[PDB]
């Protein structure tokens, strides 16, 4: 039987034309395989869709059948209102329930209400030529290999780690801290902060901040860290003046910039190295944008939605977006097409080989906690706050935030 579905998407600018062509290819395949089902693509600017169009359709109880959806508050509100299709059974039928890095941003009371299309990871960009100058012939696999790479770089008077964390950019220090204390304490520590089951003051979390301070005190983190903006820290790396940079994968376009980058012919990438505890082989990431589906569906619409999901959420489709546009997969194990750029392949392998991902701590704690950590790590690197006093300050605001509801 005939069924028409509107597919609200955000791939409207010319820079998104290959992602749109990817979507259209998936649609055509789905329409061949489910005769009678047709998809009317409705491209709308991302912020217009989020803040205006989808929001009003949801208030009216009439979303399109398929729509670009953000995780977090948006998905929480629309699921609560009953307008999002629960996806648990479809994922199980398609064998997809364990194939994504992280669905928590689309999960409400155990039920999955959306599927991220792409996201970000964090890791070390590094300069292969500066590494070779210091005798480092491969990326550090482990923390001990990481510290001796740092020692070798310092001995050659090469700034080891670029970082711009001054003024209002404490969040950039928190990227590195984030992953250091997940490496020292494991991912479960930060999951429990907002629940009261774990604490910022736990010794393995404290250890991460002690290691962070030691990187700064030994000159491995750029001594000028607190006098540099985030973008200037990126600049320190990509103009060739630091051996590595911990940053999110959104920074690839800056690292490969046609006008500003001098390292784009000799840049590599590696995950945060293994310390040997509960955080080995994990990669930090976030996946907050993808497709949600209307709950207000007849049987024909439910069949076409499942068929679209089956054809869209595949390793091949994920891999095409990665290779062409440096769109970081939401799905695990995605291979990079051989035609991709070397840095794209480097990030893809670091992500694809990861055992699992963990969220940014700020996806797990209250805004006030996030703001406090940003100020605190600046004072930590600045020698004005000890690691012990940082974690007590953090748990004090964490306790107050948790009492905010309960």
Author numbering: 47 to 452
Task: Please share text taken word for word from the publication where this structure appeared.
In conclusion, we identified and characterized Paenibacillus spp. NagB1 and NagB2 proteins as SBPs for chitin oligosaccharides. Binding experiments of the recombinant NagB1 and NagB2 to several oligosaccharides using differential scanning fluorimetry and surface plasmon resonance confirmed that both proteins are SBPs of (GlcNAc)2 and (GlcNAc)3. SBPs, a component of ABC transporters, are responsible for trapping ligands that are imported through a specific pathway formed by two TMDs, and mainly define the specificity and affinity of transporters. The structures of NagB1 and NagB2 were classified as subcluster D-I and contained two α/β domains connected by a hinge region consisting of three strands, with the substrate-binding pocket located between the two domains.
